[PDB]
């Protein structure tokens, strides 16, 4: 070869300030978009039972104080009490350390023992052992309360005391040799412990809202299901007529010009927002066509795809499709998904075919869940199971996936039958 400064050929590229703004325009959500678009509308002048129910509710923390009021105590005890039950979660254990609470008092007289008292007084209130300060003892408090008469009590009390690590790593072989408990009788002690309500505060608050706005819609009319955009959601600008009919007859150059410039802007912006929409519908549509599959079938039946796959079905560039897919959610019979979502990595199976990781990762989740609970399936054992299916994933892939689904290991999910 040789080094020189010659010239090449054959290409195509063009851009401008205003067009740029028109292009970034479809990369951001309608709700966050409509904001940007309201702002345009201030700048451009030619472009356009009182309390019902209001039922105040309980709230747990609010519940804790109602009994604080009718507990008897001093002003210092009622001050620390407000401090303590101030700092308590929806779950119900306390957020701050107890020595921290002492720093919140800012009093020389106040002592840890004094705090130990007011705390424990309000530690068995409603519901049981709440304001825990790190569960272990919360369990120990609920144990505390009920009668001696129930068997296996001392057993559950021994384990819960200082053998927590033993129970969290589910190493019952070690548990047996350490605690020197009964073989497959301890099981029922552990079952007692199991039914004791960890997270006793949660209970109170339950009233949680409904909240998600689908951008596009897709819905099984006779087969060949068809996409239509969300009418209510879609933003729309409409020309002001008054001001349109006040540019010509205008007597001054200032005014006349003024009105022309704005109309120019405005017509352009309309046309640009109009563009956003069309793209996105054309595109919605083109992604669900290929992914016909998936709606009926499930997460398993998803074909593995890349943007290229969906860009070459349209005439637009890849990046463009990438900008229009971000944060749009499209509602379907099956549920609400982000449009991003469809797109994933492939892996190569037997028979030349490829499989979407998403679908394999859905597959792994069903397979792992639906197994004998005495013998957990390890990752590699699964790799082998999948290979029967044809997937030929490898073991770290599967670990990756198996740990992504927020599911812990096999030796760690082993339990007593």
């Amino acid at each position: 070869m040789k080094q020189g400064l010659q010239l090449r050929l054959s290409q195509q590229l063009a851009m401008t300030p205003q067009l740029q703004q028109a292009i970034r325009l479809l990369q951001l959500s309608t709700l966050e978009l409509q904001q940007e678009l309201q702002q345009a509308l201030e700048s451009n002048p030619l472009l356009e039972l009182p309390v019902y129910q209001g039922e105040t509710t309980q709230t747990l923390q609010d519940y804790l104080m109602w009994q604080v009021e009718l507990t008897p105590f001093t002003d210092t005890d009622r001050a620390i009490a407000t401090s303590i039950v101030d700092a308590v979660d929806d779950t119900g254990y306390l957020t701050i350390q107890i020595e921290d609470i002492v720093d919140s008092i800012g009093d020389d007289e106040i002592g840890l023992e004094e705090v130990e008292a007011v705390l424990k007084r309000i530690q068995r209130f409603d519901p049981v052992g709440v304001a825990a300060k790190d569960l272990r003892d919360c369990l120990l408090i609920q144990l505390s309360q009920f009668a001696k008469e129930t068997p296996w009590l001392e057993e559950a009390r021994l384990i819960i005391s200082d053998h927590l690590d033993l129970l969290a790593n589910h190493d019952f072989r070690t548990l047996m040799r350490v605690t020197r408990l009964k073989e497959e009788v301890l099981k029922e002690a552990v079952n007692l412990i199991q039914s004791l309500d960890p997270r006793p505060g949660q209970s109170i608050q339950t009233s949680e809202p409904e909240y998600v706005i689908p951008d596009v819609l897709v819905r099984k009319v006779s087969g060949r299901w068809t996409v239509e955009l969300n009418a209510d959601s879609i933003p729309r600008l409409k020309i002001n007529q008054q001001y349109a009919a006040m540019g010509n007859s205008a007597r001054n150059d200032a005014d006349g010009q003024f009105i022309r410039s704005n109309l120019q802007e405005a017509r352009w912006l309309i046309k640009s927002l109009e563009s956003r929409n069309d793209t996105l519908l054309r595109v919605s549509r083109c992604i669900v066509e290929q992914q016909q599959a998936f709606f009926e079938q499930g997460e398993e039946y998803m074909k593995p795809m890349v943007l290229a796959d969906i860009a070459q079905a349209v005439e637009m560039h890849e990046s463009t499709i990438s900008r229009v897919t971000t944060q749009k959610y499209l509602h379907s019979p099956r549920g609400i998904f982000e449009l991003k979502y469809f797109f994933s990595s492939h892996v190569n199976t037997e028979g030349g075919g490829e499989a979407s990781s998403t679908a394999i990762r859905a597959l792994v989740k069903k397979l792992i869940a639906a197994e004998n609970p005495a013998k957990p399936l390890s990752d590699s054992k699964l790799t082998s199971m999948l290979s029967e299916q044809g997937i030929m994933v490898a073991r770290r892939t599967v670990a990756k996936y198996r740990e992504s689904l927020s599911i812990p290991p096999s030796n760690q999910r082993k339990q007593l039958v």
């Binding site: 700048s43 002048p45 019902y52 409904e210 909240y211 998600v212 205008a250 200032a254």
Partner: protein, 50 residues
């Protein structure tokens, strides 16, 4: 006071406030751009009515 839960839809108390706020914002943004007298007078009349 959300009716369906998805949209709160504040009515009879925040609609007029919203109206007045956006109209005053548009008027204050247009008064600095050297707008003609007719447009700014119509915007002021609309803000007065709101």
């Amino acid at each position: 006071v959300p009716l369906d839960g998805g949209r709160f839809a504040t009515s009879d108390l925040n609609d007029l406030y919203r109206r007045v706020i956006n109209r005053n914002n548009r008027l204050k943004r247009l008064l600095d751009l050297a707008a003609p007298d007719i447009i700014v007078r119509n915007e002021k009349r609309m803000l007065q009515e709101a």
